[PDB]
Amino acid sequence: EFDNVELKDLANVLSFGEAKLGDNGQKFNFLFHTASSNVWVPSIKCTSESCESKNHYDSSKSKTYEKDDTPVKLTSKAGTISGIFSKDLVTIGKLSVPYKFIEMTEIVGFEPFYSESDVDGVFGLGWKDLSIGSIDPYIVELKTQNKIEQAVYSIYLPPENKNKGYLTIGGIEERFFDGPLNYEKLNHDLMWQVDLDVHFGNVSSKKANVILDSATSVITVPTEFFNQFVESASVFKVPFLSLYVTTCGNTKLPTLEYRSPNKVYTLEPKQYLEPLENIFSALCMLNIVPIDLEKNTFVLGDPFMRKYFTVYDYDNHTVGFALAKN
Amino acid sequence: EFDNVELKDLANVLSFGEAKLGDNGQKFNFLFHTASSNVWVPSIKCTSESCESKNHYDSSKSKTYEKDDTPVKLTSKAGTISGIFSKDLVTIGKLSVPYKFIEMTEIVGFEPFYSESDVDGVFGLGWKDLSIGSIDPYIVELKTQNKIEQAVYSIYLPPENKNKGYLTIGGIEERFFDGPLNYEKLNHDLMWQVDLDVHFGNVSSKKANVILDSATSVITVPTEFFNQFVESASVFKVPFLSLYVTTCGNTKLPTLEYRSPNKVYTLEPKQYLEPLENIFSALCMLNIVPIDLEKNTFVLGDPFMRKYFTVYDYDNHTVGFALAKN
Numbered sequence A, B: 001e002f003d004n005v006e007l008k009d010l011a012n013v014l015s016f017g018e019a020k021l022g023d024n025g026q027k028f029n030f031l032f033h034t035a036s037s038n039v040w041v042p043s044i045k046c047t048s049e050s051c052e053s054k055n056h057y058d059s060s061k062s063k064t065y066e067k068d069d070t071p072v073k074l075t076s077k078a079g080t081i082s083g084i085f086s087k088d089l090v091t092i093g094k095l096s097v098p099y100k101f102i103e104m105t106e107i108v109g110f111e112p113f114y115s116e117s118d119v120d121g122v123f124g125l126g127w128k129d130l131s132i133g134s135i136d137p138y139i140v141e142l143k144t145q146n147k148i149e150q151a152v153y154s155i156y157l158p159p160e161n162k163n164k165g166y167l168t169i170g171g172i173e174e175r176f177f178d179g180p181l182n183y184e185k186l187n188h189d190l191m192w193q194v195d196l197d198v199h200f201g202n203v204s205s206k207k208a209n210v211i212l213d214s215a216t217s218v219i220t221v222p223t224e225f226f227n228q229f230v231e232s233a234s235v236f237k238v239p240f241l242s243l244y245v246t247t248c249g250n251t252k253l254p255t256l257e258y259r260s261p262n263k264v265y266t267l268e269p270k271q272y273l274e275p276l277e278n279i280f281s282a283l284c285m286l287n288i289v290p291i292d293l294e295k296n297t298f299v300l301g302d303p304f305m306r307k308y309f310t311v312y313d314y315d316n317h318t319v320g321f322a323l324a325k326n
């Protein structure tokens, strides 16, 4: 069949899994991130309080380590992180190829996400042009090395939450989905991003840049677009910190439509609302958030990926969509 | 009368206010923090993305600047921040005295709190032994310079939320409170901290170290203590991110008792629960959080300070409590 990796759930984002580095197979907990293109791991030299309880990579204990040592210093407001490049075996299931990754020397910030969960680093699965160092993506490298037949991968997330998810490499596994598998052309080879027309209420946006992101637990929508949606949709702002809140059985809330020239992709209130209560419960949390990334940009996260099984095809520069089984 | 400063509300913590540095009176938004003992401000040399939209301090533009230049580098997992000491005029209302503060050269992390709100830095109002540099507290310096009669200050927070609060320096303003003003001995001259016996349900902790902290929007309780409290109190854990949730009219939840050898300080469910709904609302958010600071340590934040007007007396090493008016 095809190679798997169980996706474990953490802060309501379902895309953490295990991969292994080195000839001695050091394990690491990773965020598999379709919206970035490098793999990051804590080095043994990392003297940051944050690295202290994570897994480290020791180049001196793997026979297949190749020195690189190009420095890197990624810095946002959120935190700073710096280290060096190394080449070694990177392994998922039966799949192994020398890959260049970043040994993290110093990491500050990204709290509390980082130190509190048990993720060690992130494993990007985006496009070459989005990487530091301009490095062919792992799956693409797997293909070049005649280890898999197609540079393709899929993410399955269970319609019924509680369960585990799967990242599959090198083929489409028929068991995960129902009906036909629709493809859409990428508008850029950066992130996995596609042109769609998006209608919410009577509020709509044509030729929107919509991005598939596993690291997101939520549905993203431009600020202007979100305000129109909520205004006269009987959704209520309240909080200490955002939300927002509505009735679970609210027959006012619309279906979310993402239309391509072939197929329309829909999200029912049932799939973008979250139960707040255990005693009750008529009361629900709206999984749609106002976020401005880039002129006209929507993010599809877990809520969407939990309905739709998604196929990421490096060979054809397309994204596949199907209704998820189980 | 006595010198004021309006407390502005930000992320449901009500203790942001304005003070001025230099002879040219450069304004800054400050977190007035009773649990720390330095004043921090963004320098003009700060090249961090985070400083970009804050107010800066320019020593070259104030006639009363005195060079110091002792370096500082405070570093947690949360973020890193580094700068140098300067002496200049620090002004709140009619009150002005040369004070040593920290010009921040570099600041990474503390996201998203910092860059998203409009606070520039923090103005500590704790005890000497808690500072970097071992520097007499601002109000204590104000006294030494014969600018105020007692090194004392008070924090008033409106019972009814929406309104503004006040930090008052050098006297007790009778209008803010009702009834008698009770004093408690500090157990240490570090933070404003006091020995009390704390009873929640039948769950209780004797000779607890309880800390007054304005920067906290919440009531803090040791983990073991919190678990006992919630177990069989019909409070429910649910979330993406904590909470917890209960009925607003829940006649099970106990009164919170903080007893000293003279006076018992109480918190009713009404004062430690927060409405989640606007349509409805029977449904409430519990403002008490499990946090382990130090063996037997409780934090009293806004929910408590909104009932009790609090006096901070440097001269007598005491904390005053009274039922807040208005």
Ligand SMILES: Cc1cccc(C)c1OCC(=O)N[C@@H](Cc1ccccc1)[C@H](O)C(=O)N1CSC(C)(C)[C@H]1C(=O)N[C@H]1c2ccccc2C[C@H]1O
Binding pocket: A010, A011, A013, A036, A037, A040, A074, A076, A078, A081, A110, A113, A114, A120, A121, A122, A215, A216
């Ligand atoms: C943390 C880290 C460790 C090792 C190595 C790297 C590169 C790391 O990333 C630092 C960084 O610059 N991350 C970028 C994303 C990025 C990574 C790599 C290259 C380019 C960009 C961004 O600032 C960021 O944190 N984002 C962007 S969107 C997002 C809200 C999903 C979030 C995220 O990653 N995670 C979210 C999440 C996921 C699960 C649970 C909770 C949360 C909260 C939130 O933080």
Ligand SMILES: Cc1cccc(C)c1OCC(=O)N[C@@H](Cc1ccccc1)[C@H](O)C(=O)N1CSC(C)(C)[C@H]1C(=O)N[C@H]1c2ccccc2C[C@H]1O
Binding pocket: B011, B013, B036, B037, B040, B076, B078, B081, B110, B113, B114, B120, B121, B122, B215, B216
């Ligand atoms: C932020 C900053 C800017 C400039 C300069 C300085 C010194 C700054 O302080 C960073 C720091 O080391 N803060 C220390 C306190 C401190 C300050 C100075 C010297 C020594 C210790 C502490 O660990 C801390 O962040 N705490 C203690 S408990 C807490 C969770 C309330 C939190 C806090 O402050 N704020 C919370 C809050 C409040 C409102 C809204 C959101 C949030 C999230 C959370 O961060």
